[PDB]
Amino acid sequence: SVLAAANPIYGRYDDLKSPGDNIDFQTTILSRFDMIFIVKDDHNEERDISIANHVINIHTGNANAMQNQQEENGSEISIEKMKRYITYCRLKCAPRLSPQAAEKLSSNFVTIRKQLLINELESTERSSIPITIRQLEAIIRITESLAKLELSPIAQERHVDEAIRLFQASTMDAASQDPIGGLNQASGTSLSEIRRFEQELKRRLPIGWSTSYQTLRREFVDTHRFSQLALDKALYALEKHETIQLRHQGQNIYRSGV
Amino acid sequence: FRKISRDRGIIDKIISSMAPSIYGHRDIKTAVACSLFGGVPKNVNGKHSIRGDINVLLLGDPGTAKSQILKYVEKTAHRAVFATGQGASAVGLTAS
Amino acid sequence: SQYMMKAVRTNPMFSYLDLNIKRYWDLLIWMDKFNFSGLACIEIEEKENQDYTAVSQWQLKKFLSPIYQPEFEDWMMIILDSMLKTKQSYLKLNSVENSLNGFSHLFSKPLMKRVKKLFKNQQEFILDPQYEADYVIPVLPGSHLNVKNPLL
Amino acid sequence: DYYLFLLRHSSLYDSFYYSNYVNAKLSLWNENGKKRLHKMFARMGIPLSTAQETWLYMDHSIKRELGIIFDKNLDRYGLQDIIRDGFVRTLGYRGSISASEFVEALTALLEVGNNSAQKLTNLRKRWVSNFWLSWDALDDRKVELLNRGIQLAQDLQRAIFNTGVAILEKKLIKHLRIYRLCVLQDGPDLDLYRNPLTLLRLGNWLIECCAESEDKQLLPMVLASIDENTDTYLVAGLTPRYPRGLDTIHTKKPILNNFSMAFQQITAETDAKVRIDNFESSIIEIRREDLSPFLEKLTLSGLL
Numbered sequence A: 001s002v003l004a005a006a007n008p009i010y011g012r013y014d015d016l017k018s019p020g021d022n023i024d025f026q027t028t029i030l031s032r033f034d035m036i037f038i039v040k041d042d043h044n045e046e047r048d049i050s051i052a053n054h055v056i057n058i059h060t061g062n063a064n065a066m067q068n069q070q071e072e073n074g075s076e077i078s079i080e081k082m083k084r085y086i087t088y089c090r091l092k093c094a095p096r097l098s099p100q101a102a103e104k105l106s107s108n109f110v111t112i113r114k115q116l117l118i119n120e121l122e123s124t125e126r127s128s129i130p131i132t133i134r135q136l137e138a139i140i141r142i143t144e145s146l147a148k149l150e151l152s153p154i155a156q157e158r159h160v161d162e163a164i165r166l167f168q169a170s171t172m173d174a175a176s177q178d179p180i181g182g183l184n185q186a187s188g189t190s191l192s193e194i195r196r197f198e199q200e201l202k203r204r205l206p207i208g209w210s211t212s213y214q215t216l217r218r219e220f221v222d223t224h225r226f227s228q229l230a231l232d233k234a235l236y237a238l239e240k241h242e243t244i245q246l247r248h249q250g251q252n253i254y255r256s257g258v
Numbered sequence B: 001f002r003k004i005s006r007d008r009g010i011i012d013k014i015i016s017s018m019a020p021s022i023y024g025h026r027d028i029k030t031a032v033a034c035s036l037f038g039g040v041p042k043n044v045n046g047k048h049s050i051r052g053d054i055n056v057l058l059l060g061d062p063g064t065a066k067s068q069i070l071k072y073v074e075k076t077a078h079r080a081v082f083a084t085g086q087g088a089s090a091v092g093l094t095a096s
Numbered sequence C: 001s002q003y004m005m006k007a008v009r010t011n012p013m014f015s016y017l018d019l020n021i022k023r024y025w026d027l028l029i030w031m032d033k034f035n036f037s038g039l040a041c042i043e044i045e046e047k048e049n050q051d052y053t054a055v056s057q058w059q060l061k062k063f064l065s066p067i068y069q070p071e072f073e074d075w076m077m078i079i080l081d082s083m084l085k086t087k088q089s090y091l092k093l094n095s096v097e098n099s100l101n102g103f104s105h106l107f108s109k110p111l112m113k114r115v116k117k118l119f120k121n122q123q124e125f126i127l128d129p130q131y132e133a134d135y136v137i138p139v140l141p142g143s144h145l146n147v148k149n150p151l152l
Numbered sequence D: 001d002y003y004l005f006l007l008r009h010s011s012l013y014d015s016f017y018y019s020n021y022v023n024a025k026l027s028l029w030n031e032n033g034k035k036r037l038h039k040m041f042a043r044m045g046i047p048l049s050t051a052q053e054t055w056l057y058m059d060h061s062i063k064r065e066l067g068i069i070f071d072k073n074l075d076r077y078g079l080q081d082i083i084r085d086g087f088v089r090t091l092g093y094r095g096s097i098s099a100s101e102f103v104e105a106l107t108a109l110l111e112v113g114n115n116s117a118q119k120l121t122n123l124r125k126r127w128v129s130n131f132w133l134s135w136d137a138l139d140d141r142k143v144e145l146l147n148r149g150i151q152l153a154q155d156l157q158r159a160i161f162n163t164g165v166a167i168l169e170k171k172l173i174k175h176l177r178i179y180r181l182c183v184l185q186d187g188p189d190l191d192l193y194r195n196p197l198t199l200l201r202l203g204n205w206l207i208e209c210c211a212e213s214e215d216k217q218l219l220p221m222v223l224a225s226i227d228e229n230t231d232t233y234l235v236a237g238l239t240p241r242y243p244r245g246l247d248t249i250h251t252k253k254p255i256l257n258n259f260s261m262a263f264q265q266i267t268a269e270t271d272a273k274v275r276i277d278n279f280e281s282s283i284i285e286i287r288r289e290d291l292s293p294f295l296e297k298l299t300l301s302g303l304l
C-alpha cells in the first residue's frame, strides 16, 4: 500500500486560481489513489486557540500525565497491541458483500459519475481529479476494510454508508472545488449578467421582505433572461452575508442587507 | 562559568560580544546568539519527535556585513560547514 | 446645536420630527444605558460660569460586597475629578485624545496603598465568624457568575 | 547489608543514586554531587561500565570483595554509616530478598496499584482496594505481584527525585520564623501526591536533605499539594529529625508532633472549610480559598 504526501504548486492551494493550474499530477497517477485529501487552513480564532493550547500542553509535559490514563482505562491501546490486532485481523478475516450492498453501491456510483458530467459541461474543461471504475472498486475495498475491523464475515449497508461518506469527504470534495469565478470562457456572458441580475434583484426587493424561487424564476424568465446557471448566483449573493438568505426548507429567499 | 553565569545582564553582554567589530544590527546579533545556543529537542512517549534548533534568514541590501557575520558564526561554532550559491549540489548537501 | 436642528428639520425626510436637547455633557463615561457617569449641565447660560452636576449611575456596583460598594463610588469620584483636572490643564496649555493622557498618575500611588491595606484586612477578617455580615456576595435577578475573592 | 535503595534488583550506580542518605551527604541534585560520585566510583576501583550492570550479572570478583572496598574507601566521603546488618530470606532456587526491599515493595503496592464528595469517595475506595493487593504479596505463591511492586517502587522513587530537584533548585522552600512552608501549585504529575504516602515520601526526602545541612535548626515543615479536580490542598505537617549518625547525648523521646492540637485550635475558632478526618491527625484537606488566611492564623497559633 502507498501513503503519499505532497504540496501544491506555489506552496498554498491559492483558491483564486483554477484547480488544473494547482495540481501537477497527471490523470494517469491520480486514478491509482483510492482517497485524495486536499488540506487547507481556515484561520479561525477558536480553532487556533484550541490548537495552541494542545501544542503547549505537549511541550510543558502535561501530555504524558494525561495520555497514560486514557490508555489505561478504555479509550486507547498501545502500539504493540494495535499491531497484533492488525495482524490477527488480516490473517483471520476476509469479508464479502451482501446483495443489498451491491445495489446501494451501484446507485452511488451512477450518481457520483453523473455529477462529473454536469461539472465538466459547466466548466467546459476536463476534470483534473478523475472518477472511474477504480473509484467504485475503492469504495468496495473501503467497505470490506470497515467490515474487517469487527471480524464480521459479511459486509452490510451499515458499512456501505460509512464508506460512501468517507469517499464523499475525500475525493468528491476535492473534485467539487466549485470556483466562485475564473473569468474564463465558461459563463462569459455571466460576467455581466451576474451584475445585471444582482441590480435587478436589489431594486425589486428592499432590505426587508422576502420572495420565492418559483416567482424569481417564472417572472424573471418570462422576459427570456434565464441562463440555467442562476442556482449558484443566489448562493454567491448569500456569500456577501447581506444580499440573500435562504429559509423555510430553501423555499423562502430573504433580503437581509445591502 | 558558574561564577559569571549569575551576574544580572549576562544575556546583554553575550549579545554585545557577538561580532564586536561590526557596528549596530543588534537584532541580527540577537538572532545569531539564539541560533548558536539553541533549543531543546523533545520526544513525547517515544512516538512524537519535536525539533529543537533555530534557523535564521538574513535578507538585506548589499554592503551590510552579512557575509562577515556568517564567517564569524563559522569561526565560533564547534562544528561548521560553509557553502555558497551554485557551488553546491543536491547530493553535496546530502548523502551520496 | 441650533444649526444642526435647523438642518435636520429642513430635510423633507424629517419635516415632522420633534427634537429637543435635554442635557449637555462636558465629560462622559459610557458603557451602556444602565452604567454611565460624568458631568452635565441642563442648559447653558450667559456671562455666568455654567453650573455642572455630577451624575453616576452604576449597576455594576450592586454585584459587589457591602464593604466594597462605598469604595467603588469613592474611587470613581476621584477618577472623575482627576480626569476633569487634566482636561482643564490640557485646554489651558494650548490618534490620541491628549485631553486625558496622564490622569492616572495623580491617583495611582494612593490606590496601590489602599488596595494593600484592604487586602491585609481581608486576610485578617475573612474567616472571622463575627464579621460574617461583611463579605457576603448578594443574589440578584440575572446573576450567573460564581466567584470567590471579593476584593478581586 | 547497606543503606542502599533496592541493591539486589537494580544496579550499584542506581542504588547509590536514589538513596536518601547518599543524596543528603553528597548533594546529588546538582552537577557537583554527580561529579563527586563519579570520582568515588573511579577511586574504589570499579569501572563505570561494570557498576551499571544488573546485580545478578555483575562481575563475581567485584561482588566477592565489595565489603573490603566499602570499608577502606567510604570513610573519605563521609558515607561510613551505610554499612549495617539486616535479615535476608531465601527459598530454594529462587533468589534472596532483604526486609528493606520487601517493605518498599509493599509500600509501592499500597501507593499505586490496580460534586467533589463523590470524587473524594472514589479515591478513598481505590485506596481501600490497594490494601488487598498489598495483602496478597505476603503469600509465597504470589511472587509476580512482588516483582510488580518492586518496579512500581523504582518508578515512584524516580518521580520523587525528579520533583525534589525542582523544589530545591527554584528555592520554593520559604523560611518563616515558626515553621518552613512548601506549597506545590504548578508542575507535572501532581496527581501522585493526592495519596498521603507519596507526600510522606517527598517529605522524608526533604527532611533528610535538611538534616545533614550545616544549618542548625529544628523547625517543623509544612507541605501542601493542590488537586485541580477537587480544588483542594492536601496539607501535611512533618517533624524535624536529627542527623542519622549523630551521638546519643541528644537521644531521648523524639521530637513531638504538635500539629494536631494547632489544627484543632484553629478549626474550632474559625469557620474554615477544612477536613480533619484521616487517622493521622497531621494531614488535613483544606479548600483552595482558605489556604492563605488559615496559614496566617497558624503563624500566630504557636506550639510549633
Ligand SMILES: Nc1ncnc2c1ncn2[C@@H]1O[C@H](COP(=O)(O)OP(=O)(O)OP(=O)(O)O)[C@@H](O)[C@H]1O
Residues within 6 Å of the ligand: B021, B022, B023, B024, B061, B062, B063, B064, B065, B066, B067, B068, B069
Ligand atoms: N557596520 C558595518 N556595516 C556594513 N559593512 C561593514 C560594517 N563594518 C564593516 N563593514 C565592512 O563592509 C564590507 C561589506 O561587507 P560584506 O562584504 O559582508 O557585504 P555583503 O553585501 O553583505 O556581502 P555578500 O554579498 O558577500 O553577502 C566588509 O568589508 C565589512 O568588513
